[PDB]
Design a protein around this ligand. Structure first.
Ligand SMILES: [Mg+2]
Ligand SMILES: [Mg+2]
Length: 664
């Protein structure tokens, strides 16, 4: 059922993806690379004292604080959902091999018994109503670009000046490029305007993953992560194999002379993709105004900040169901891309812009190095983009694509299983829009708070409440999938956007509280995804600009966890045993140094200003800007702090671009 074409790096089709510069050529050729991360300045992830510390601490905390999760996946008591063995990885050393990305997810969806389009007219109206509500009365804003981010295919530039030029040029030439694509002239659009080509596959670490201790043997077991070989990826699973990647770290002693303590493993590696910047810039110019609309008008469902902000909504509910979606990005349906595009055309959006948007979600993928002696292959033909990868992580609107799919998927689940009396309110497009507008503002007896694949579904008192309880029971039983669209289950230890919903003896939302996840504190402090990048002079360009700052926001973020104090004492005791030093003093010194360094980057901050004007969100984001890509948004961060991490193209250039895209 159609194997995707594949081209080696030597092929002209792959060569055309990399510009005639050292950075682009190095990216094309880069072989498999691995190494210990510099966890903190002058400390490697594989340091014997650090691994001794991790062994003692993970064992102690699991022993003294076993998980408190009930039969319905509700967290209670200590606020712990699993063991603390997730920290036991040799950070910087990945599992081998990483997966080859699936060129087509059509068979994957069909075999999982998931729909190839909207099941009913009601569902079709709801998905289309979501497009009309999300993309309608948008306001232009400056196009913000992350400092130090790559432009990927074809230039691979990390320079802000070059990035601004590329983005401004892209906004000027998007119409001409989109019109060429409408004529089927993809090669011309790419050659002239660098809009097309492929996504560049980057493999990212998921630093902590499940590890269990087998009581029978006293030996640790890592969670098996299934990977697809090249044959499986190109055939969409028709041929080739899906097998467990090797997390065995024994190899590090032989290859690198690194001592590997018992029960320490190689890290899980996830595919991530970087988009061709010239294609992403015109998409981002529309995506940011869309986020501003949904986070303002539909703030109830979509805008999530603090644990108390979430708590105020959830406390009003009679029932709260914390859902889980299996492999969201790979299962994301191409028919939704086509439905979105069709509806934007119906609204009066520029056909050339819709074509660029459509193309961004069908683009080929360049596979770098999943393992030693593997990769350097382009999947799909850039002359006619036709891939069905699901949702590409580096696309300019991925968060919105996951949010649109999932928000409607959950609403449909609530309609099907709990509220058939509301079906009469969804008769046509105007009534579908009126109903969805009301639902998204939290005005109906069925409610939700969501972001992509993370959500909490609510029921107030009323006719739907009884159905709500049956749906929860169906999820607990786990025999029937409640959705025709995605694989839905209940979360084992309900949480929403990093905050655990802590229930009491009553097991009711009214008396439940949102608390920080203590395991996330440990993940962030002892298993960061990236090293400190001490060689990158401009700190704002680093993946972890100011790691020391997270100590100042720790109490605000995690202080509400029942075992907060216990964990900090256990850390201090174990760090003393391992290093013969105070961890608290070590972090206080790092906090002082990073606070001083920060003033160099903030115009409003004098030579030794201090953190007085900064919020806990500001501090968490300066230590980890990745939180700005999955947890928070621009409006949640102080203006002077957002400027440290991002730079923009003028609103004058974006305003003119947006006028040409949008309906009359
Ligand atoms: Mg899952
Ligand atoms: Mg959830």
């Amino acid at each position: 059922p159609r194997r995707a074409p594949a081209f080696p790096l030597s092929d002209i089709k792959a060569q055309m993806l990399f510009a005639n510069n050292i950075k682009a050529q190095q990216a094309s050729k880069r072989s498999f690379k691995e190494g210990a991360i510099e966890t903190y300045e002058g400390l490697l992830s594989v340091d014997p004292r650090f691994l001794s510390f991790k062994n003692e601490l993970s064992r102690y905390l699991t022993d003294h604080f076993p998980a408190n999760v009930d039969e319905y996946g509700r967290v209670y008591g200590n606020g712990v959902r699993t063991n603390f063995f997730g920290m036991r990885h040799m950070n910087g050393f990945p599992m081998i091999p990483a997966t080859w990305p699936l060129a087509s997810n059509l068979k994957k969806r069909a075999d999982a018994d998931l729909a190839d389009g909207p099941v009913s007219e009601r569902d079709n109206l709801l998905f289309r109503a979501a497009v009309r509500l999300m993309f309608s009365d948008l306001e232009p804003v400056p196009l913000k670009i992350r400092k130090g981010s790559s432009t990927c295919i074809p230039y691979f530039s990390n320079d802000m000046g070059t990035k601004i030029e590329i983005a401004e040029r892209a906004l000027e030439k998007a119409e001409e490029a989109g019109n060429l694509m409408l004529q089927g002239k993809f090669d011309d659009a790419y050659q002239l305007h660098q809009m097309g080509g492929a996504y560049y596959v980057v493999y990212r670490a998921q630093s902590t993953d499940a590890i269990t201790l087998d009581p029978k043997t006293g030996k640790f077991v890592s969670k098996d992560r299934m990977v697809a070989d090249f044959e499986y990826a190109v055939t969409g699973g028709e041929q080739g194999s899906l097998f467990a990647a090797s997390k065995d770290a024994s190899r590090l002693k032989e290859q690198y002379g690194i001592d590997v303590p018992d029960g320490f493993f190689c890290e899980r590696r996830r595919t991530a993709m970087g988009g061709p910047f010239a294609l992403n810039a015109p998409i981002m110019a529309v995506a940011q105004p869309v986020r501003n609309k949904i986070y303002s008008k539909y703030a109830y469902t979509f805008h999530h900040t603090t644990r108390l902000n979430k708590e105020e909504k959830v406390k009003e509910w009679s029932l709260c169901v914390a859902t889980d979606v299996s492999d969201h990005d790979t299962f994301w349906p191409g028919w939704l891309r086509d439905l979105i595009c069709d509806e934007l055309l119906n609204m009066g959006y520029a056909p050339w812009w819709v074509k660029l948007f459509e193309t961004s979600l069908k683009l080929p993928v360049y596979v770098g190095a999943p393992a030693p002696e593997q990769g350097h292959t382009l999947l799909g033909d850039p002359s006619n983009p036709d891939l069905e990868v699901g949702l590409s992580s580096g696309q300019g609107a991925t968060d919105l694509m996951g949010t649109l799919l999932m928000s409607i998927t959950y609403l449909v689940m609530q309609l099907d299983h709990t509220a058939p009396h509301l079906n009469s309110r969804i008769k046509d497009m105007p009534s579908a829009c009126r109903f969805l507008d009301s639902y998204w503002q939290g005005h109906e007896e069925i409610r939700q708070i969501s972001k992509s694949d993370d959500a909490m579904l609510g029921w107030t008192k009323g006719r739907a409440l009884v159905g709500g309880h049956r749906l929860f029971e169906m999820l607990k039983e786990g025999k029937v999938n409640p959705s025709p669209y995605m694989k839905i289950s209940y979360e084992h230890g309900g949480a929403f956007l990093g905050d655990i919903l802590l229930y009491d003896s009553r097991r009711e939302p009214g008396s439940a509280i949102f608390v920080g996840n203590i395991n996330s504190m440990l993940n962030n402090q002892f298993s960061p995804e990236y090293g400190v990048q001490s060689g990158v002079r401009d700190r704002s360009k680093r993946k972890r600009p100011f790691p020391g700052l997270a100590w100042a926001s720790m109490k605000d973020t995690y202080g509400a966890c029942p075992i907060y104090s216990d964990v900090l004492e256990a850390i201090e005791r174990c760090w003393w045993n391992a290093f013969g030093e105070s961890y608290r003093a070590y972090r206080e010194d790092m906090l002082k140094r990073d606070t001083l360094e920060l003033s160099r980057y903030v115009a409003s901050m004098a030579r030794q200003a201090g953190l007085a004007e900064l919020t806990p969100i500001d501090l968490e984001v300066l230590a980890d800007p990745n939180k700005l890509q999955y947890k928070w948004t621009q409006a949640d961060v102080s203006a002077n702090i957002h400027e440290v991490l991002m730079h923009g193209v003028s609103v004058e250039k974006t305003e003119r671009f947006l006028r040409s895209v949008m309906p009359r």
